[PDB]
Write an enzyme that holds these catalytic residues in place. Sequence first.
Site, PDB file in Angstrom:
ATOM      1  N   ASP A  45       0.809  -1.210   0.000  1.00  0.00           N
ATOM      2  CA  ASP A  45       0.000   0.000   0.000  1.00  0.00           C
ATOM      3  C   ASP A  45       0.850   1.272   0.000  1.00  0.00           C
ATOM      4  O   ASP A  45       1.885   1.321  -0.652  1.00  0.00           O
ATOM      5  CB  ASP A  45      -0.936  -0.024   1.218  1.00  0.00           C
ATOM      6  N   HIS A  86      -3.516   4.999   4.364  1.00  0.00           N
ATOM      7  CA  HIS A  86      -4.292   3.785   4.086  1.00  0.00           C
ATOM      8  C   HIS A  86      -3.616   2.501   4.546  1.00  0.00           C
ATOM      9  O   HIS A  86      -4.269   1.619   5.112  1.00  0.00           O
ATOM     10  CB  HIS A  86      -4.618   3.712   2.596  1.00  0.00           C
ATOM     11  N   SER A 260     -11.607  -1.903   0.398  1.00  0.00           N
ATOM     12  CA  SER A 260     -10.215  -1.865   0.830  1.00  0.00           C
ATOM     13  C   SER A 260     -10.065  -2.230   2.311  1.00  0.00           C
ATOM     14  O   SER A 260      -8.980  -2.603   2.749  1.00  0.00           O
ATOM     15  CB  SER A 260      -9.611  -0.487   0.574  1.00  0.00           C
TER      16      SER A 260
END
Length: 473
Positions: A45, A86, A260
């Site tokens: 990520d 994230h 996600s």
Amino acid sequence: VYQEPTDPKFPQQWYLSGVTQRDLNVKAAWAQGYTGHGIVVSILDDGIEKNHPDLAGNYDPGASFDVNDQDPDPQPRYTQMNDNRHGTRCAGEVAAVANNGVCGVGVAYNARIGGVRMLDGEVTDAVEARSLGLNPNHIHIYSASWGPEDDGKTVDGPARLAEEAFFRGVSQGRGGLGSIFVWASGNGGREHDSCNCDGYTNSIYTLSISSATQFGNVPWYSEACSSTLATTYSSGNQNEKQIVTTDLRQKCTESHTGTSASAPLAAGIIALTLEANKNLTWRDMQHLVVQTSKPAHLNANDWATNGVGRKVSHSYGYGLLDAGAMVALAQNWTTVAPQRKCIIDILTEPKDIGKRLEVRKTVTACLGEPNHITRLEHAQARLTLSYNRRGDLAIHLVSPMGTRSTLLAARPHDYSADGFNDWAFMTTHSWDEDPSGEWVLEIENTSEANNYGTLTKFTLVLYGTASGSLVPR
Ligand SMILES: N=C(N)Nc1ccc(N[C@H]2C[C@@H](NC(=N)N)[C@H](Oc3ccc(NC(=N)N)cc3)C[C@@H]2Oc2ccc(NC(=N)N)cc2)cc1
Ligand SMILES: N=C(N)Nc1ccc(N[C@H]2C[C@@H](NC(=N)N)[C@H](Oc3ccc(NC(=N)N)cc3)C[C@@H]2Oc2ccc(NC(=N)N)cc2)cc1
Ligand SMILES: [Ca+2]
Ligand SMILES: [Ca+2]
Ligand SMILES: [Ca+2]
Ligand SMILES: [Cl-]
Ligand code: NA
Ligand code: NA
Ligand code: NA
Ligand code: NA
């Protein structure tokens, strides 16, 4: 004797433990003594805040790298907009520390957790390959919540280095047992996206996961497709609760969202399962998910019973992951036989599509040969076709056992005239079926327009074995 976590936000993690039956049954796995000890998970990520008070205790430099800046330290780049938050959120979902008075807990709160910083920069084929191929004899499970643009008009998958990384991973990774690649199926629901157009999630080598809202519905952002295997809870409307996890700048957030968020939860459940049986292969893991996942209380208008009696949906795959059931079944699991691959070139001549094309073909699935398959795993229809407006097409594939897989749904925004170039549409919906017999491919123009095109190649690719069937459900 098992004491559940005392962390301050653990009661807000409704998807882990609840009275409701609307959870992932993770407490049941913890009570059997599986919390992730010895298992290594990496988040691919935008970086991981390795000094986060709820991640530091489980952080593993061996599961981490920074491919964007080419150094070992995946620390996020801090910006005013907190863009690079994230990976940290995803890491906490898998493996936030338990019983430490901070935030909530990970699904596998005793697993080791790392991150690859690879989204914060130009993401080339090489960048992807080096991330997927990171320390594959140390990392057990990879989690990825990224992919081709979810604009509902893109058809794209791994290029050569990345595809090579997938094959090297499942072949030689984890001591030959194969890397476990867990993938989010997509967030293009609002654009009416169809996730078989995403080659990462559509891959047989990735274990693809979709989302359900708290009240058991298909979220606004969900993409339906036949390649999805199963589901975990994530966000929905503003009356429904969300994901509680570690956030950038050493914070705790109660508002992590989308598909996600679903992949990391699945990766955590898979970590518990690996602890219960370290000898599971990458294919074993997908079998376990197929057999144990639970449709109950998930609402969809397309639930169907396949040839071996399992309920399957294009929104949910085989349903909600069940951690307790996964770890139970894992313990005495017998390794599946080596994977066979039966290649069937279907067409004898190109076929005009027009308003509707139906192709029927009776197959023996390599009868009499070493690749003979009586137990299907993945099936692909690898199609090459031209068409004037791609998004007007809908494509279905029907198995000999009568299971209708949607390979492609209409995509209103997809105006492309580029068609499909040997695109390997994949379905999991016929898992464990006998593939001998009549297969039917249906291609139709869902619009009123006078569209035109030609199907020039249809390869049916069957994967599976010829041994070990269960009595149908
Ligand atoms: N969404 C996030 N969480 N992060 C994030 C933030 C910004 C972006 N923007 C993308 C835009 C993206 N644009 C395009 N691909 N067209 C860009 O790709 C490049 C960049 C440079 C070159 N050429 C060259 N000679 N190097 C070619 C393609 C990477 C470019 O990516 C970055 C990212 C950071 C930085 N800056 C930095 N790391 N200090 C520079 C480019 C992407 C992701
Ligand atoms: N073309 C343009 N004009 N602009 C443009 C459009 C798209 C991209 N790709 C970027 C977009 C970029 N998005 C934004 N900058 N808003 C995306 O940023 C993310 C995505 C996911 C997460 N993690 C999470 N848990 N949600 C964190 C950051 C990476 C995402 O990076 C990739 C890169 C490659 C691939 N692979 C592929 N396309 N085959 C997938 C995602 C870059 C430039
Ligand atoms: Ca770095
Ligand atoms: Ca904690
Ligand atoms: Ca998509
Ligand atoms: Cl292959
Ligand atoms: Na192998
Ligand atoms: Na997949
Ligand atoms: Na048959
Ligand atoms: Na028939």
